[model samples]
Target: VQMDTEEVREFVGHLERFKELLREEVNSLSNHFHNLESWRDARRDKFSEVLDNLKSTFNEFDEAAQEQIAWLKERIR
Candidate 1:
């Protein structure tokens, strides 16, 4: 779908924020997983769950981003 001026701008803003979130979550997950010995089994499992949730959220964000980018690409062509 072609985005109007406002919708495209809003989507760009959301995309920027989500990019930040994805970066931070990825760092947190890497730190947690890389130092697995510091966490107990249950704690590690909880961390894993958090990572899974983050991944799912990112997937949703990514879908929206892909759609916007594809639309914008066509507009530029």
Candidate 2:
């Protein structure tokens, strides 16, 4: 039981950091795309829609990860 608890702690810690990193990367990419739009003013609609879709997908993935993290913590108790 002690070993199992330690394993969960280790895994959860890494999982959280990874999720944070993924979020930061997504934000960076989104900002870059928007900056491009400001500079080019070309295909604005296309870029906007694509960015929205990508954001939607990122949110979905993040939610799933959050669910897993919650489940893991609950089990630890």
Q: Provide the overall lDDT of each model, using Cα atoms, as 2-decimal numbers.
A: 0.73, 0.81
Q: In angstroms, give how far residue 45 of model 2 lies from its true place.
A: 5.3
TM-score of each model, in listed order? 0.53, 0.70
Tell me the number of clashing residue pairs for each predicted model. Answer: 0, 0
Residue 8 CA error for candidate 1 (Å)? Answer: 6.1
Predicted model with the maximum TM-score:
2
* Alpha carbon deviation, residue 48, candidate 1 (Å): 1.2
Model 1 residue runs over 4 Å out of place are 1-28, 31-35
Candidate 1's TM-score: 0.53
Tens-digit lDDT track of model 1 for 1-77: 44476666677677778777886878787776867776777777887888778778777877877787677656644
RMSD of each: 3.8, 2.9
Runs of candidate 2 with Cα error greater than 4 angstroms are: 1-3, 37-50
